[PDB]
Each structure stands twice: as C-alpha cells, then as structure tokens.
Design a protein around this ligand. Structure first.
Ligand SMILES: NCc1ccn2ccnc2c1
Length: 182
C-alpha cells in the first residue's frame, strides 16, 4: 500500500523460506549465504524441512547475551544448494526504538500476510513463556500462534523476528548486524 509495505514485500519475496520443525511451521529469514534465523522455541534439530525439502542442518546456535540471558534467536546454517541475497546491510548496529513498522508472515497456514504494527518500543527484559529474555521489541498488535518468525521491518531496515505475544501486544527479538559477522 506504501513504501514500508514495498520494503517488507521485497524482503519476503527473496529472503524468506517456510521452515518446518517438530514444533510447527515458521517464517524463516535468510540473512546471507546459507545462514538463516528462526525463534529458538522452534527447537531446530539435525534435519529441518525448508519449503517442504528435507535439509541437513550444518550448524545451529541459540544466541544468549554476555549475561548468559536468552535472546530467543537461533542462527541456522542450512545444507541448501542456493545462497540468500545478502541483506546484512539492512540490519541495525544498535538497540533502538522505531516508528511505523510492518510485521510480515509467510507460511502454509498464513501466506502473503502483512501487518502495520506502528510504533516499536525497545522493551528490553521480558519473561517469555517463563524464560527471562533480553533485547525484546514490543508493538501494540494482537499477534497469534503461527506468526512466530515473522519479519519486523521499517523502510530500509530489518529490525527483528516475532517470538511471542500476550493477546494485546506482540514481541520480537532484535536482529543486530554484529550477530552475522562471518
Ligand atoms: N488464517 C490464515 C490467514 C492467512 C493470511 N492472512 C492475511 C491476513 N489474515 C490472514 C489469515
């Protein structure tokens, strides 16, 4: 509908896949080469389905901060025969608040879904499903099960992936440029 949705659509069309684990189907953001991200509660194993193709996992790392606190991001390297468009230049360097964000989702249950969520707060600490979690972004939109792994963008920035909600608010884990130095 406008330039925020234009940027969101460009990320979804080239830099997402449908990831299936034993815990469900998730939007999965490809960042560069064969490296993608997914919420840690997806419980990635040795094998994952990527667009319904059986795929070996070459590496999976559940990120924590230097306080040894959950960040709810898992970085996955996939045994896939094709590289992602490198979008690391769209990742913020520091923790921040944002105006006018879009949460975008693409699964078999939730195809071609775009949600204008408005203002995004640097929330920080969240007890997420009982797990102390840091670097949480918050938006005032009633997100639902199946939106996990959804991409949060503003024009020219990929800022987070959706990891939970409380019925009234939605919560995303930050993506930072420093997670993807190779
Ligand atoms: N219940 C499935 C679904 C899929 C895509 N959507 C886009 C907007 N609302 C929906 C709902």
């Amino acid at each position: 509908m406008g330039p925020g949705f234009d940027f969101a659509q460009a990320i979804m069309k080239k830099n997402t896949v449908i990831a299936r684990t034993e815990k469900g189907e998730f939007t999965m953001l490809g960042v560069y080469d064969r490296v993608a991200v997914i919420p840690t509660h997806a419980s990635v194993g040795e094998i994952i389905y990527i667009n319904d193709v059986e795929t070996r996992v070459l590496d999976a790392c559940a990120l924590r901060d230097l306080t040894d606190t959950n960040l709810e991001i898992t970085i996955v390297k996939l045994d896939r025969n094709q590289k992602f468009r490198d979008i690391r230049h769209f990742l913020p360097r520091c923790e921040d608040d944002y105006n006018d964000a879009v949460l975008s989702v693409h699964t078999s249950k939730f195809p071609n879904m775009y949600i204008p969520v408005g203002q995004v707060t640097n929330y920080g600490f969240l007890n997420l499903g009982g797990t102390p979690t840091h670097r949480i972004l918050m938006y005032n939109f009633p997100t639902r099960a199946g939106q996990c792994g959804g991409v949060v963008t503003t024009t020219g920035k990929v800022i987070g992936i959706h990891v939970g909600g409380n019925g009234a608010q939605g919560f995303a884990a930050m993506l930072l440029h420093s997670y993807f130095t190779d």
